[PDB]
């Protein structure tokens, strides 16, 4: 409720490029959301970001053993932990579910939104394409983009603006690294 | 850049709340329950392939707390400014009457990392099967959080995610009902 608040954060960050070929380690310290001191592996010592960080930058850079340890973190920490998690994070692949429905119950020759909802997948890279009688439709496509569910799955809704005619079949085609070949779901116009 | 792992920690006074978690590309690998002193895997399967000694976390949090009390005094007792959350409700999957589904309440871009979340069905608190994430870090040093409610879709029910935070003048409801 009433009383005032003080917040410390620390972030120990590991940035990976081309596997573990390049790694950048950042030790970051925050008071509220104000970053006040950090160690950057590309710099090799602590620097005050703000006035409040100079004491810790001077106390910590004088520690030869601390500095040697922080300079080896790309190895003992970043590459190490990447190695530990690799099989269930980096290589995690979870199979998409694909559902197609019209946004609205409409009669034919009214405009509708055909929704291709793609759910439960990992990783995030996905391709969702729309076809009209098996010709790709490139205009009138409306995507949410990636939604992170917070449980190591994504969803995305990719919608097609159209005026369905009698007979017409629309297809949503999904490509994802969990798939050996595209998933396709059909909607036949009422 | 291909991937990012962040060990994110906070300590908050005078609430005496601390968190320790790992984040891989925006998802939680694990956090440490400070109270039970135990490693909590985001998915069960993770704890089969990897371990974490929870004690290391308690130790980090003790130092974070000492460091906060230094910084507090060094700041001349400059308090945090409250940033109220954005709240979004969506389903796990497309909704079908009598097909089990999950409502997700995504609480975003807020600080401090303190929030009360209540699921309301027809204006009334429900908790059967609910769950929630710890506070997840953002690149702008604000927080994110997910709450979950399993539900049976029905034409008779409406739902609200009710969020209380110190930066909101009043509690915020985000609405969902079957169309």
């Amino acid at each position: 409720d009433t009383r005032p608040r003080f917040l410390e954060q620390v972030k120990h960050e590991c940035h990976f490029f081309n596997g573990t070929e390049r790694v950048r380690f950042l030790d970051r310290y925050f008071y509220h959301q104000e970053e006040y001191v950090r160690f950057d592996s590309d710099v090799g010592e602590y620097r005050a970001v703000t006035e409040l960080g100079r004491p810790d930058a001077e106390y910590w850079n004088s520690q030869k053993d601390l500095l040697e340890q922080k300079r080896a973190a790309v190895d003992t920490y970043c590459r190490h932990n990447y190695g530990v998690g690799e099989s269930f994070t980096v290589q995690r692949r979870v199979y998409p579910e694909v559902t197609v429905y019209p946004a609205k119950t409409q009669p034919l020759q009214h405009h509708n939104l055909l929704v291709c909802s793609v759910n439960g997948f990992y990783p995030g890279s996905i391709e969702v394409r729309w076809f009209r009688n098996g010709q790709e439709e490139k205009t009138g496509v409306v995507s949410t983009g990636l939604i992170q569910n917070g449980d190591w799955t994504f969803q995305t809704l990719v919608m097609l603006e159209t005026v369905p005619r009698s007979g017409e079949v629309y297809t949503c085609q999904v490509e994802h690294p969990s798939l050996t070949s595209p998933l396709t779901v059909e909607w036949r116009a009422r | 850049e291909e991937h990012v792992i962040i060990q994110a920690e906070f300590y908050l006074n005078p609430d005496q709340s601390g968190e320790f978690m790992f984040d891989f590309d925006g998802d939680e690998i694990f956090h440490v329950d400070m109270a039970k002193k135990e490693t909590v895997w985001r998915l069960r399967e993770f704890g089969r392939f990897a371990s974490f000694e929870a004690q290391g976390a308690l130790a980090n949090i003790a130092v974070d707390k000492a460091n906060l009390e230094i910084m507090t005094k060094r700041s001349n007792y400059t308090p945090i400014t409250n940033v109220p959350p954005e709240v979004t409700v969506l389903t796990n999957s497309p909704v079908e009457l009598r097909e089990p589904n999950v409502l997700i309440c995504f609480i975003d871009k807020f600080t401090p990392p303190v929030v009360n979340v209540t699921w309301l069905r027809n204006g009334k608190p429900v908790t059967t099967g609910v769950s929630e994430t710890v506070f997840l870090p953002r690149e702008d040093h604000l927080f994110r959080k997910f709450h979950y409610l399993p539900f049976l879709p029905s034409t008779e029910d409406v739902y609200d995610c009710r969020v209380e935070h110190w930066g909101l003048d009043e509690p915020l409801l985000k609405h969902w009902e079957f169309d």
Binding site: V10, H12, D27, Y29, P55, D56, E58, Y59, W60, Q63, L66, A73, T76, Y77, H80, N81, G83, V84, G85, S87 | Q7, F20, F22, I29, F30, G47, R48, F49, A50, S51, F52, E53, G56, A57, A59, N60, V63, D64, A66, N67, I70, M71
Partner: peptide, 15 residues
């Protein structure tokens, strides 16, 4: 598990 994550420690603050 196969292997233990390493927790990166932090230095104590200039008091």
């Amino acid at each position: 598990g196969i292997a233990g994550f390493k927790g990166e420690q932090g230095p104590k603050g200039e008091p």
